[PDB]
Amino acid sequence: DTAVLVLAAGPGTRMRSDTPKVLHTLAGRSMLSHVLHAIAKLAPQRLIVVLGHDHQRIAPLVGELADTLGRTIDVALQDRPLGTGHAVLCGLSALPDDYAGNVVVTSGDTPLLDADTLADLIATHRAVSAAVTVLTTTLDDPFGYGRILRTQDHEVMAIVEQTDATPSQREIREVNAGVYAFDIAALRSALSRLSSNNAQQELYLTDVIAILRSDGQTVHASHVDDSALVAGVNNRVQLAELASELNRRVVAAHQLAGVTVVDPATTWIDVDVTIGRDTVIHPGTQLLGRTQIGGRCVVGPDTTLTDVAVGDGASVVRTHGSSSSIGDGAAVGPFTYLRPGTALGADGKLGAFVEVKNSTIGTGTKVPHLTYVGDADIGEYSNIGASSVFVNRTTVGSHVRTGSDTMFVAPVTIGDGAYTGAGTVVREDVPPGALAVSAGPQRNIENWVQRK
Amino acid sequence: DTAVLVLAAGPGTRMRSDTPKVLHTLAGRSMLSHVLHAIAKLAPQRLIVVLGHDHQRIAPLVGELADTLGRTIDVALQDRPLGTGHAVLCGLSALPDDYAGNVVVTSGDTPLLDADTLADLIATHRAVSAAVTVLTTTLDDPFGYGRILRTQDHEVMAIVEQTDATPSQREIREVNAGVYAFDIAALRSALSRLSSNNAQQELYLTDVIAILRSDGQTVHASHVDDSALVAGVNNRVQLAELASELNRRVVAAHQLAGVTVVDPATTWIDVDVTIGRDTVIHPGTQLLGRTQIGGRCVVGPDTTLTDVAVGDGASVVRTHGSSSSIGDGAAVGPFTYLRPGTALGADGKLGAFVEVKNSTIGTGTKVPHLTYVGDADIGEYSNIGASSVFVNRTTVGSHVRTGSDTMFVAPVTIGDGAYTGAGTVVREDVPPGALAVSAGPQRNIENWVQRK
Amino acid sequence: DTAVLVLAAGPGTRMRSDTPKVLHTLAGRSMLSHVLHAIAKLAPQRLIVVLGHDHQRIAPLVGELADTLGRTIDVALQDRPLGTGHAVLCGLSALPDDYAGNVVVTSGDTPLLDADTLADLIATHRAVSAAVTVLTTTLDDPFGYGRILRTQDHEVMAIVEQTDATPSQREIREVNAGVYAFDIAALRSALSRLSSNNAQQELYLTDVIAILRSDGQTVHASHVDDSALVAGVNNRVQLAELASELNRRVVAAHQLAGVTVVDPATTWIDVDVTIGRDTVIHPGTQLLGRTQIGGRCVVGPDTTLTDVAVGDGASVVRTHGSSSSIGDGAAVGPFTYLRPGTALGADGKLGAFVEVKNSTIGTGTKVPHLTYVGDADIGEYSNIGASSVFVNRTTVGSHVRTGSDTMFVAPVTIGDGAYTGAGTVVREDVPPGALAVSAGPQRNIENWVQRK
Ligand SMILES: CC(=O)N[C@H]1[C@@H](OP(=O)(O)O)O[C@H](CO)[C@@H](O)[C@@H]1O
Ligand SMILES: CC(=O)N[C@H]1[C@@H](OP(=O)(O)O)O[C@H](CO)[C@@H](O)[C@@H]1O
Ligand SMILES: CC(=O)N[C@H]1[C@@H](OP(=O)(O)O)O[C@H](CO)[C@@H](O)[C@@H]1O
Ligand SMILES: CC(=O)N[C@H]1[C@@H](OP(=O)(O)O)O[C@H](CO)[C@@H](O)[C@@H]1O
Ligand SMILES: CC(=O)N[C@H]1[C@@H](OP(=O)(O)O)O[C@H](CO)[C@@H](O)[C@@H]1O
Ligand SMILES: CC(=O)N[C@H]1[C@@H](OP(=O)(O)O)O[C@H](CO)[C@@H](O)[C@@H]1O
Ligand SMILES: [Co+2]
Ligand SMILES: [Mg+2]
Ligand SMILES: [Mg+2]
Ligand SMILES: [Mg+2]
Ligand SMILES: [Mg+2]
């Protein structure tokens, strides 16, 4: 059997945040969600998330995530901030006393930890018949991490916390990832022998290593060369360095699968985003949420799309949009705002300084300049003049030509093939094939300027 | 004599692209074009580009490039994907049998290879009286490249392909750039001795090295320290890493020549772009095509310009434009769209939420807010009110003041010094110095709001 | 006693600029200003800035800076470009002959030099009882810097200029930072023994080291590990590398204090900018000048703000603004332009394609689409229809609803709770609770399209 505990109990005081550390997000999931998704793929028999401060704020999101992953996720509360050693103990109490499996310990602030790393850890753990196996790695800057101590003979002695290391030890660049596999009897038995005489006056989980080494138990360290996989987040400088490392990888994966990305460093792609072959993404682009881009698209510089669906061969340039759909071969931008519920048919055009909200717009229809469309349904191959406003429901037919400077005052229906004169205010329905007008006739006042 | 072959025959399957590898672009030229420009500057007597898959799609662009560089470029077809060794052979068939020159082999996926490197290679080749000279370099990640094998005595033994190296050899970090100079008799004679018993069942050009070493011929390797100069492109992650390296260099060259670039990493400058002394470029700027910027300009953040000409001391801020000209001391932006054929005279202004298309706009005239100008010619020192539309030809005189919310319905002529009232629709000509109006008079309905 | 000289006398010819090197800016101060601020914090008894070329252009800004820092800053002119050795001499002439203090020499092209480094230098200088102490550092590329020469015994021999080093010496990677502390009698006495037989035919300050070593005086070098602290600026590639290093640090300091910064590399924050806890900054953001952001704000991608004040919990997305204030919980963007003098009350909204200039806008009022507001005061909880223009003073009351396509022709007053019909031109005052209209009635011309 195997059980995974997720240590999400700490305060994250160095985040300086009213929002709990473990719910800050990157690439579209919270850290906690990234950690849980990864574990879920490995499918251990039990899964326990230990919470402490802010638990009423984190618990409901653990339950939300248990439904999305379709499995039970238990929650063990930690009453006293008595250390991580104490947190494992709290977590074990959600396990039956008779429990015979392996226990794997993990935190929830390690968002790039993946299912293979855990697998390699369990496999290695079982292969060497070890009481405790710990993931290590080595870093340029090892600040804030337990250091790994070994004999002459390379044997793992102990783990010394940052607050507790001599200056001489603070130099050690092998670090404790804080990801372990334990034999359960050995874990139970060393947790009892933890004392809190140390710099933080806590029960260090990391003391368990020296303890089992004392009983002449087998202690294994498994070095992870790709340090990003087990990097943790304590503050916002680390949050962003890893949001950025994860972004590099998402982008590179899209590039190898056929997407041209002009500039990876300023192209942000959330984990659920799909993009078709031979589309080009220009720089300053964020593809967020469940956004889908077809193939042979152009996604223009300085574009932001959240939960937008874009068909094949469409261009979406300098566009700020969400919760909207854009058809094949359609043209959006530059300087275009899509609010929730915009659907633009195939071959359609929303141009410069156009805003659409909750509007359905038919195949091949063009709204190219300076106009607001909201709460409107517009038919096919229609053309909406510059400088207009759908004054919010309105329905507009197919093959319509509305003139510049038309205000459609909802609710109003414009019939197939109708026209509107420049500067018309439409307050009553327009029959198919009629010209609606309201502008007064021009009058020239000669020599007005000499006089005034 | 000297002949250059360009090996552009392969499939680029790892690009995952319906567009042939060698025609993907960076900084304004396709890879093929970058390679050919560089060779062209060296001016060898013959120049042969070997094509294979997609040759009907690549051939016409080779001919297009031969005219631009004003020299003959021959095309040798490779009938069977039988290897690069085979590709050199196909390429040699476009040479006369009596041919006595040096042959230099190059690919066309090496876009930063420059005329000096080739020169250094030919010079070195002749200096050491060598049968074969190959360019090498050393890399952090040597994946996918032939490895260079040497004796104890540092003598070049052979080149081993990635697919063919032992794990022990895959560690070697000296790589084959795939750029060579051959003595022709030696090249002909080792091409005949190539066999295809290897991992790809192809005729490896790289086997030619071991072969000439066998006949006790002179084999020279010339190490290139600047690895970017001979880096090749197999996939889109490599395309962008080098588009980015080339961009660093273009930008740095502009910085040393007097252009302030706030942020090189997000400033994209195509190779043909010229920029004057003491202009400042702010971040998120792309200067593409034959775009020219004068001096003491400000080019604002988040600006995209393609084949735009900008005079001296003009500002072009948050502007998306192409195929357009902007005069000295003019002001464009923020949030401004220039379509093809926009000319804005000196001291002119196109402001926020303005779109211009095919329009000529005179010295010192201002279009500052919320307006569409297309197919129009506007004179000098005129002022176009906010929220207007040139409803496309229209001509507007000099010293005009058109009021807000005016629709000029083409075709219409507005005389010098004329005015337009706020919300006028202009359908007939306006005499110089006349006030054109059409808006109805205001009426106040008192206490309407209590009633409704 | 202690006196600081700032060597700002050189020509900066490699800047290629009509603007003096030392006045090019980064993060909101000129280099000179950064250097002077840092020294000012240390508060030496005397402070002398030596000027040479362009001194009439730099002097008035030295005086401006003396008032801001509230202390006397003297200016010593250098008549002849006779070297840096000569420049120290010119600088000493502003000191009394009897002067007994330490002299510290600094340039003004070293913008990240900080008050601690100077302090460490003075302290070290006094601690070792040294005649001359020089700051050194070591670099990947030491080009253009004096090299540090030492015996077998690690004792500082001399400093050799770039123009003067053997190729063998050009390899030395310990460099002279050009920041020193001198015992004054020793400085006076070695300046007299400087001769100009060297590559630039100048009086090298750096020769002073070999000279004092000759008199068997104590020569100390103090190595600075953080090389950015003493990096100098000769050209625009170096200007931007350090503008970028300083930006990393400003941003990281905000991140550790509680600001989420999605992308540091494209987030530019000037030194005076303050940002509250738990605000998020998205990429492509510049926060320039005395800009202040409250807490829990969202500052949207692609935003530029200069001397903007933003309250708490407001969003400012895709906005280009300056000299303006935005209240708590207000919404600005996307695609919004704020000119000088915009004040938007708490809970207010300026939306897509809106431009405001010199306008005051009351609590909870919304200007959401396609409109120009300038020279206007608008009351509370009002709503301004899309596609409108304040045709500039206008006053608008509270709880107003103005319809789409309204032109307010200043000067005009709109009473509390008044309405305006769609497409109204307002030329006369509107009583509280009145409906102002001017649009003509709609007319449908049936079958117009068949006929035309
Ligand atoms: C359990 C413990 O006492 N210390 C751990 C632990 O420190 P924290 O301050 O709790 O983050 O996490 C580190 C791994 O992220 C690890 O290096 C260290 O050994
Ligand atoms: C009449 C109109 O064109 N737009 C209205 C309309 O825009 P929405 O996109 O529907 O939010 O409703 C808003 C009322 O919440 C109002 O601020 C705005 O003026
Ligand atoms: C001709 C050949 O057989 N192999 C060459 C060749 O491999 P390709 O898979 O054909 O790209 O190009 C490399 C240089 O880009 C070089 O390293 C290698 O030795
Ligand atoms: C009348 C007008 O102002 N603009 C027209 C006009 O803009 P262009 O910039 O010329 O493409 O022609 C288009 C017809 O292809 C049409 O979509 C748009 O409505
Ligand atoms: C005073 C002198 O003769 N040379 C100095 C000096 O060279 P400049 O060319 O004047 O920048 O500044 C360098 C420090 O930025 C230092 O390395 C060098 O030793
Ligand atoms: C009438 C109007 O709406 N806007 C005017 C008005 O804008 P300002 O934001 O005030 O610069 O004054 C300008 C005169 O300098 C003029 O170019 C523009 O047309
Ligand atoms: Co109107
Ligand atoms: Mg941690
Ligand atoms: Mg290749
Ligand atoms: Mg209008
Ligand atoms: Mg210098």
- The total of other beta-carbon atoms located within 10 Å of residue C157's CB is 14
Which residues fall within 8 angstroms of residue C173, CB to CB, at 6 or more apart?
Answer: C138, C139, C140, C142
A448 belongs to a structural domain: no
Contact A43, A120 (CB under 8 A): no
Determine the Cα–Cα distance for residues C373 and B370; give it in Å rounded to an integer.
12
The strand pair at C156-160 and C147-150 is best described as antiparallel
Determine the Cα–Cα distance for residues B303 and B299; give it in Å rounded to an integer.
7
Which residues fall within 8 angstroms of residue A185, CB to CB, at 6 or more apart?
Answer: none
Determine the Cα–Cα distance for residues B88 and B48; give it in Å rounded to an integer.
10
Determine the Cα–Cα distance for residues C374 and A353; give it in Å rounded to an integer.
19
Determine the Cα–Cα distance for residues B65 and B107; give it in Å rounded to an integer.
16
A368 belongs to a structural domain: yes
B446 belongs to a structural domain: no
Which residues fall within 8 angstroms of residue C54, CB to CB, at 6 or more apart?
Answer: C20
Q: Which helix (H) or strand (E) holds B160?
A: strand B156-160
Rg (CA), chain A: 30
- The total of other beta-carbon atoms located within 10 Å of residue B245's CB is 16
- List alpha helices for B199-338, DSSP H: 207-214, 236-256
Contact A384, A364 (CB under 8 A): no
A355 belongs to a structural domain: yes
Is the domain of B264 the same as that of B384?
yes
Nearest to C258 among A16, A389, A407 (CB): A16
Would you tell me the crossing angle of helices A31-42 and A115-127 to the nearest 10 degrees?
50
Determine the Cα–Cα distance for residues A342 and A338; give it in Å rounded to an integer.
6
Contact B373, B367 (CB under 8 A): yes
> N- to C-terminal Cα distance for chain A?
94
CB A266 to CB C261 under 8 A?
no
DSSP class of residue C440 equals P
Would you tell me the crossing angle of helices B207-214 and B184-191 to the nearest 10 degrees?
110
Amino acid present at A184: I
Is the domain of C338 the same as that of C294?
yes
Is the domain of B164 the same as that of B269?
no
Q: Classify B307 in phi/psi space as left (phi over 0), alpha (psi -120 to 50) or beta.
A: left
Phi/psi at C249 (5° precision) = -80, -35
Minimum-distance ligand 6 atom for the alpha carbon of C339: 9
DSSP class of residue B301 equals S
**Ligand 4 center to C391 CA (angstroms):** 27
Minimum-distance ligand 1 atom for the alpha carbon of A159: 19
DSSP-assigned states of every residue in B85-148: HHHHHHHHTTS-TT--SEEEEEESS-TT--HHHHHHHHHHHHHTT-SEEEEEEE-S--TTSPEE
Q: Which of B228, B258, B288 is the last residue of a domain?
A: B258
Measured at the alpha carbon of residue C242, what is the angle toward residues C135 and B226, in degrees to the nearest 5?
Answer: 95
Instruction: Give the C-alpha distances (Å, rounded to integers) separating B86 from B8, B9, B184, B194, B212.
Output: 12, 10, 15, 9, 17
Measured at the alpha carbon of residue A49, what is the angle toward residues A43 and A55, in degrees to the nearest 5?
Answer: 150
Structure tokens at B135: 């360019």
CA neighbor of C408 nearest in space, from A388, B423, B438, B436:
B423
- The total of other beta-carbon atoms located within 10 Å of residue C33's CB is 23
Q: Which of A258, A288, A316 is the last residue of a domain?
A: A258
- The total of other beta-carbon atoms located within 10 Å of residue B95's CB is 19
CA neighbor of B312 nearest in space, from B325, B331, B289, B293:
B293
Half-sphere exposure of residue B257: CA atoms within 13 angstroms, side-chain side: 11
Q: Which helix (H) or strand (E) holds C214?
A: helix C207-214
Amino acid present at B131: A
Amino acid present at B451: R
Is the domain of B86 the same as that of B55?
yes
**Ligand 4 center to C371 CA (angstroms):** 21
Q: Which helix (H) or strand (E) holds B46?
A: strand B46-51
* Residue A134, beta-bridge partner list: A180, A221
Contact B266, B248 (CB under 8 A): no
Rg (CA), chain B: 30
> N- to C-terminal Cα distance for chain C?
94
- CA trace torsion A165, A166, A168, A170 (10° rounding): 30
- The total of other beta-carbon atoms located within 10 Å of residue A410's CB is 14
Q: Which helix (H) or strand (E) holds B321?
A: strand B319-326
Quote the domain boundaries for residue A147.
1-258
* Residue A47, beta-bridge partner list: A4
Phi/psi at B293 (5° precision) = -115, 135
Q: How far is CA B150 from the centre of its chain?
A: 39
Phi/psi at B7 (5° precision) = -80, 90
Asked if the bond preceding A411 is cis, omega within 30° of 0, the reply is yes
Coil, strand or helix: which one is B445?
strand
DSSP class of residue C430 equals B
* Residue B29, beta-bridge partner list: B26
A49 CA: distance to closest CA in chain B (Å):
38
Contact A193, A246 (CB under 8 A): no
Contact A333, A354 (CB under 8 A): no
* Residue C408, beta-bridge partner list: C390, C426
Minimum-distance ligand 1 atom for the alpha carbon of A205: 1
- CA trace torsion A32, A35, A36, A42 (10° rounding): 180
CB–CB contacts below 8 A, A to B: 156
Is the domain of C228 the same as that of C296?
no
- The total of other beta-carbon atoms located within 10 Å of residue B316's CB is 27
Contact C373, C395 (CB under 8 A): no
Structure tokens at B367: 């279009």
The experimental technique behind this entry is X-ray
Determine the Cα–Cα distance for residues C125 and C142; give it in Å rounded to an integer.
25
Q: Which helix (H) or strand (E) holds C122?
A: helix C115-127
Q: How far is CA B21 from the centre of its chain?
A: 15
Structure tokens at C41: 């914090």
* Residue A74, beta-bridge partner list: A48
DSSP class of residue B434 equals -
Q: Tokens 């309201």 appear where?
A: A438
Determine the Cα–Cα distance for residues A338 and A307; give it in Å rounded to an integer.
11
Measured at the alpha carbon of residue C14, what is the angle toward residues C10 and C16, in degrees to the nearest 5?
Answer: 105
Would you tell me the crossing angle of helices A207-214 and A184-191 to the nearest 10 degrees?
110
Contact C217, C189 (CB under 8 A): no
C196 belongs to a structural domain: yes
Determine the Cα–Cα distance for residues B21 and B58; give it in Å rounded to an integer.
10
Per residue in C336-350, is it b (16+ CB within 10 Å) or e — as a string? bbbbebbbbbbbbbb
- In chain B, breaks (C-N over 2.5 A) are found after 392
Residue of B nearest to C388 (CA): B387
Is the domain of B179 the same as that of B231?
yes
CA neighbor of C45 nearest in space, from C6, C118, C95, C111:
C95
C124 belongs to a structural domain: yes
A445 belongs to a structural domain: no
Which chain A positions have a beta carbon within 8 Å of B24's beta carbon? 260
Which chain A positions have a beta carbon within 8 Å of B387's beta carbon? 370, 387
CB A372 to CB C385 under 8 A?
no
Contact B270, B288 (CB under 8 A): yes
Query: Is residue C205 marked as binding?
Result: no
* Ligand 6: lining residues by beta carbon, under 6 Å: B 366, 368, 383, 385-386, 404; C 357, 372, 374, 389, 391-392
Structure tokens at A225: 């060369």
Is the domain of C291 the same as that of C254?
no
Coil, strand or helix: which one is B229?
helix
- The total of other beta-carbon atoms located within 10 Å of residue A275's CB is 23
B423 belongs to a structural domain: yes
Determine the Cα–Cα distance for residues C230 and C247; give it in Å rounded to an integer.
16
Determine the Cα–Cα distance for residues B88 and B82; give it in Å rounded to an integer.
11
Structure tokens at C105: 């020499």
Greatest Cα-to-Cα distance within chain C, rounded to the nearest angstrom: 108
B369 catalytic residue (yes or no): yes
Ligand closest to the CA atom of residue B358: 4
Is the domain of B230 the same as that of B302?
no
- Three-state DSSP string of chain A: CEEEEEEECCCCHHHCCCCCHHHCEECCEEHHHHHHHHHHHHCCCEEEEEECCCHHHHHHHHHHHHHHCCCCCEEEECCCCCCHHHHHHHHHCCCCCCCCCEEEEEECCCCCCCHHHHHHHHHHHHHCCCCEEEEEEECCCCCCCCEEEECCCCCEEEEECCCCCCHHHHCCCEEEEEEEEEEHHHHHHHHCCCCCCCCCCCCCCCHHHHHHHHCCCCEEEEECCCHHHHCCCCCHHHHHHHHHHHHHHHHHHHHHCCCEECCHHHEEECCCCEECCCCEECCCEEEECCCEECCCCEECCCEEEEEEEECCCCEECCEEEEEEEECCCCEECCCEEECCCEEECCCCEEEEEEEEECCEECCCCEEEEEEEEECEEECCCCEECCCCEEECCEEECCCCEECCCCEEECCEEECCCCEECCCCEECCCECCCCEEECCCCCEEECCHHHHC
Domain count, chain B: 2
CA neighbor of B300 nearest in space, from B313, B287, B316:
B316
Which chain A positions have a beta carbon within 8 Å of C284's beta carbon? 266, 284, 302
- The total of other beta-carbon atoms located within 10 Å of residue B171's CB is 10
Is the domain of B306 the same as that of B237?
no
Query: Is residue B123 marked as binding?
Result: no
Contact A146, A258 (CB under 8 A): no
Instruction: Give the C-alpha distances (Å, rounded to integers) separating B60 from B5, B9, B23, B48.
Output: 18, 15, 12, 14
Contact A418, A436 (CB under 8 A): yes
Is the domain of B191 the same as that of B310?
no
Give the catalytic positions of A in this structure.
369
- The total of other beta-carbon atoms located within 10 Å of residue C133's CB is 26
Is the domain of B114 the same as that of B230?
yes
The strand pair at B174-183 and B102-107 is best described as antiparallel
Which chain A positions have a beta carbon within 8 Å of B304's beta carbon? 301, 334
Ligand closest to the CA atom of residue C31: 11
Determine the Cα–Cα distance for residues C246 and C113; give it in Å rounded to an integer.
11
CB–CB contacts below 8 A, B to C: 156
Instruction: Give the C-alpha distances (Å, rounded to integers) separating B307 from A350, B321, B343, B390, C196.
Output: 24, 9, 12, 25, 52
Determine the Cα–Cα distance for residues C230 and C222; give it in Å rounded to an integer.
12
CATH code, domain with C213: 3.90.550.10
Is the domain of C222 the same as that of C282?
no
Mutation pick for ligand 4 pocket among B392, B408, B426 (CB with most ligand atoms within 8 Å): B392
Nearest to C318 among A320, A423, A438 (CB): A320
Where in B358-427 does DSSP place strands (E)? 360-361, 366-374, 376-378, 383-384, 389-391, 394-396, 401-402, 407-409, 412-414, 419-420, 425-426
B178 CB near ligand 3 (under 6 Å): yes
Q: How far is CA C147 from the centre of its chain?
A: 31
DSSP-assigned states of every residue in C272-334: T-EE-TT-EE-SSEEEETT-EE-SS-EE-SSEEEEEEEE-TT-EE-SEEEEEEEE-TT-EE-S
Q: Which of C258, C293, C323 is the last residue of a domain?
A: C258
CATH code, domain with B272: 2.160.10.10
Q: Tokens 């300083």 appear where?
A: C246
